[PDB]
Design a protein around this ligand. Sequence first.
Ligand SMILES: O=C1CCCC2=C1C1(CCCCC1)N=C(Nc1nc3ccccc3o1)N2
Ligand SMILES: CS(=O)(=O)c1nccn1Cc1cscn1
Ligand SMILES: OC[C@H]1O[C@@H](O)[C@H](O)[C@@H](O)[C@H]1O
Length: 390
Amino acid sequence: ALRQPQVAELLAEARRAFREEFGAEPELAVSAPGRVNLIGEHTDYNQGLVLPMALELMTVLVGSPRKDGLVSLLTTSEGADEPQRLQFPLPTAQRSLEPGTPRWANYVKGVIQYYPAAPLPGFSAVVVSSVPLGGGLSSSASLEVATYTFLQQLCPDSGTIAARAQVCQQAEHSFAGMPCGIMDQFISLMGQKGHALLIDCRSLETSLVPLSDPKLAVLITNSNVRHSLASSEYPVRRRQCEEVARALGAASLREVQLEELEAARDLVSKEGFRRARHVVGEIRRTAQAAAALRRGDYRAFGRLMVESHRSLRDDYEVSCPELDQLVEAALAVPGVYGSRMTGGGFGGCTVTLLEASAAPHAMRHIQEHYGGTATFYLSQAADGAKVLCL
Ligand SMILES: O=C1CCCC2=C1C1(CCCCC1)N=C(Nc1nc3ccccc3o1)N2
Ligand SMILES: CS(=O)(=O)c1nccn1Cc1cscn1
Ligand SMILES: OC[C@H]1O[C@@H](O)[C@H](O)[C@@H](O)[C@H]1O
């Protein structure tokens, strides 16, 4: 399992790079984590239920206010596209920022563009990250939330945490061209160490669910693949879900149950019906999973994870031979409660819930039974966005 750097080490890397780059020590430091979704896939934009936890993998951003209305950025992240630096002036009423190259700067630009408070000053900042870029653990959401958290120090907003997630979400939409739901940004903002986070994506109610057992661990396996469908088929699923809700007279698939869906089978397409069945079933399973998690019922939680994956594979069709093979290998290992693809699909990571003692045995077997090269993360539930004054 990859070492996973602590905050103090990333902070120190960011600090040193900043000092060398701008000639002075930075004044502020913030962090925001990536995520793994335990269960509740492709429900968040359907106003469903999700149960993610924040990872120890995080994006760290150190910086200082400037007096010239200029923004100057540097990243050291492996995988970031060239150039590693970018400067631009703050947006104004007559001229707004715009997505372009380098791509990693669009996330930062986006948050700045839709930041709700004023006056925002210019600033200098160094970005570092332990979240694998585009690997399926929401590196971008961590970048957006870290950026938002940073801007709060420069110019405190005065709204809810949901308003913040939605700003970060808007950046992902408008500047990264990924019309994501609210989950990634919300868990990045609101995670707590030792807890998973049940999010009702209709009411925006959230609930901290304990998940801290020495005999229990969460194994994240990176397939290290990412089919182009991960980007292009995502928005298609949102339209297909919308089109099914429209035909049933429902505001969203949250208002629809399997039986109501059964009765209206001749009212939607075969493919649409399969899409809606996953969602409806997944929303149910996430409520069951949350309950199972509370009373410490790990075996039931695991089984519910396996149903989630089968549903994602057969009805919503957002899996791939890589993820499937990773899941099958995982379920063959003694001590494994459950396994499923996590995140958007078509590559990325799987999440596996197992007895802590089985993690070494599960890593060897999964790797040997995998045709590509898997990467492994053994993660505990971590905190959300934080701030440290330097
Ligand atoms: O092009 C892909 C498309 C799929 C999603 C993925 C993007 C890129 C774009 C530029 C690098 C490659 C991946 N990375 C973001 N996330 C991200 N998080 C970061 C944290 C700190 C610094 C830079 C960061 O980039 N997500
Ligand atoms: C990695 S990214 O998604 O931020 C990006 N890289 C080049 C451009 N864009 C954003 C673009 C894509 S579609 C509409 N906005
Ligand atoms: O469960 C599917 C999830 O896929 C992620 O890639 C996306 O960013 C989230 O908003 C959520 O829709």
